[PDB]
Amino acid sequence: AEVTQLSNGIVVATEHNPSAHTASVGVVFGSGAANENPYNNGVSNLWKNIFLSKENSAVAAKEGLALSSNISRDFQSYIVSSLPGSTDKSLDFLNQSFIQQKANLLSSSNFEATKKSVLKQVQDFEENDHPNRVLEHLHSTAFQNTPLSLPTRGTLESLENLVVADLESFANNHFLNSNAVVVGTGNIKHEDLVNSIESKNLSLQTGTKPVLKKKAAFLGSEVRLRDDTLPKAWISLAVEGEPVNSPNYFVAKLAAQIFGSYNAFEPASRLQGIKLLDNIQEYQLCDNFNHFSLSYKDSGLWGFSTATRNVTMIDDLIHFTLKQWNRLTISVTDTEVERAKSLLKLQLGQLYESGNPVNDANLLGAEVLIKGSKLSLGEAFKKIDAITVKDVKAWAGKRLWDQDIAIAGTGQIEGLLDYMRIRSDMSMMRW
Amino acid sequence: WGGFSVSNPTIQRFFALHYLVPFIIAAMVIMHLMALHIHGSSNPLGITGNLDRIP
Ligand code: HEM
Structure with missing residues (x-):
């Protein structure tokens, strides 16, 4: 095995x-x-x-x-x-x-x-x-x-x-x-x-892959395709994640899984959760979350995707999510970190050990090419319990605090304020 | 004119009214802002500005 x-x-x-x-x-x-x-x-x-x-x-x-x-x-x-x-x-x-x-x-x-x-x-x-x-x-x-x-x-x-x-x-x-x-x-x-x-x-075409002249970079931007014909709205924040093969993969994954997914039309999701979910649920602000922190061999992306229904209330959803990210990098309760550790453990267990062989084969191929050797989940569990509040504080002080963001959505985004009402408020001027 | 000559009541009333009026101006300009907010501000091009706006 x-x-x-x-x-x-x-x-x-x-x-x-x-x-x-x-x-x-x-x-x-x-x-x-x-x-x-x-x-x-x-x-x-x-x-x-x-x-x-x-x-x-x-x-x-x-x-x-x-x-x-x-x-x-x-x-x-x-x-x-x-x-x-x-x-x-x-x-x-x-x-x-x-x-x-x-x-x-x-x-x-x-x-x-x-x-x-x-x-x-x-x-x-x-x-x-x-x-x-x-x-x-x-x-x-x-x-x-x-x-x-x-x-x-x-x-x-x-x-x-x-x-x-x-x-x-x-x-x-x-x-x-x-x-x-x-x-x-x-x-x-x-x-x-x-x-x-x-x-x-054996595969033909012996030789080597032609090396790319440039690998990857980053820069803040927007690509919105405003069209009022579509019913709902769509946005997707982003902050540059951590590339594979780095001592920041799992801490970034935990920093993403703290806020977690959310589906506003489920009886088993509104009741649970953390501060932002409650403060959204008091009114009607959003309809879906997806905190994703995707990583690639050149650079990774830590994102935040929603598809709301309310159109006038985009600004408040964005403002609350940004203040919660600032709260993540300023102060986190120990219970929050412990819950995140447990959730991320079970999520990895489900993802890497799903019964379908194709998923496991694809992930093994990805890791063997990028990491050079498979990382059995036993070591992942061993090294995941060591993640501590100080480490996440340090990581967020680098990846998150005043870093350029990129958003791009199609739909009735028009209510969204352009750049300086979604960027220069990641510190709220009182840290 | 407070009488048949420029005297104490003349300047007294003039100064009191001068010290009063700018607050009435302030009231009128808060009305000015109220009336402005109904329909934004005009483009320099003299064309519809409802298409795009910035905060
Ligand atoms: C204390 C006096 C006044 C104040 C404080 C004031 C304030 C303002 C403000 C804030 C605006 C929005 C755009 C801008 O700032 O220019 C504006 C616009 C305007 N004001 Fe005034 N105003 C005053 C006097 C007047 C007077 C006396 C007139 C005309 C007789 C006038 C006519 C206008 C017009 C036409 C606009 C049009 C803006 C647009 O079309 O784009 N204002 N004013």
Whole structure:
């Protein structure tokens, strides 16, 4: 039940778990949206979609195995789920239809059908979703002129201007062996440990990933798309988080989980909570919270996303959330910290140990590429109880106190005051 | 004019009224502000300003 890693050409990792019985084997490429230029955006999306359609049609018809994928910023988590006794076939298919050969896959007809399907999908995502749209806009506005602001889906202008050659060029400049691994989360033990290294079962295109000239940055900005047609409102604050592989990941995660989520239309959420939730609930101010502190290998983001219903009362919601963040960095009760520790413990336990093998496989791939070695949750629990009020005070004195913010929302934001009524009030002039 | 000559009542009344009136001006200008607030302030372009405004 212990994760094993090595380094033999291509990194192979394994998180054995005979609890579940859905074996999964796949790859986790250490590149994606962050590793590609603004002018050719949805190349990763197109890859994922051509796979997820035609290879799905092939695999289900031939054998029994359902293949998924995921792209967040720098992954292509082409996980291929299977039965416990059917991992060799899955690996053989993966190495015979993803790395090579790509001729039977990139026919002009299949590529064009997938291209139009991707266009339709991104279009109706733009026309329907809203919290995801404002989150993508928040990324695109926080990291202007940097290979991290471009979204994980892409723009129609960038989507339309690529046919075959750009796709193959990106394939040959990022589907290498140096920054590609194999993940076997499920209930396999060592068959994957030896079958990945075989006479020829190896990714093509030996070499290295082209290093980006600039990594990441930050700057305060706004991208609002004010349109009164939409019913509700949407906003998303942000403060620069802490990158992965740093002695600040868990303290930032706790500093985010203190305030916690909130759904105003649930009998089991209004009653519980801390000061801001009560002071909001006295009137009607907000309708959802999401304190998220996302982190990436270049830089991380500590955010605060809402989707309210009241339109005249945006300013008061923002003012209260800012005063609560100041309260976080000035003085915190010990019971608050203890409750946060317990909640974050259970949240990590649920997230990392969900029964679905695909989630565990993707997270293991992310960690093995970024951290260089898997961090078993035992050490996380051991090192999480040591987080103390002084440490959080110190961390918030750096990341939060008078630091530039970025917000970006679509809807009836118009009531929101522009910048100096949401920025120069993070200290309330009496600390 | 307080009589047939400029004398004590003349300047006395003039000074008392001078010391009184600016408070009436203050009342009138609080009315001025009240009347202003109903419909904002005009653009220099002489066109509708209801589109965007800053706090
Ligand atoms: C003590 C006297 C006065 C005070 C305190 C005062 C105050 C103000 C204030 C605060 C405004 C808002 C814009 C600005 O500050 O200029 C304003 C605007 C205005 N005032 Fe006055 N005012 C006074 C006298 C007058 C007088 C005597 C007139 C005209 C006879 C006048 C006509 C206006 C007009 C037309 C505006 C229009 C603003 C707009 O259209 O954009 N005011 N005044």
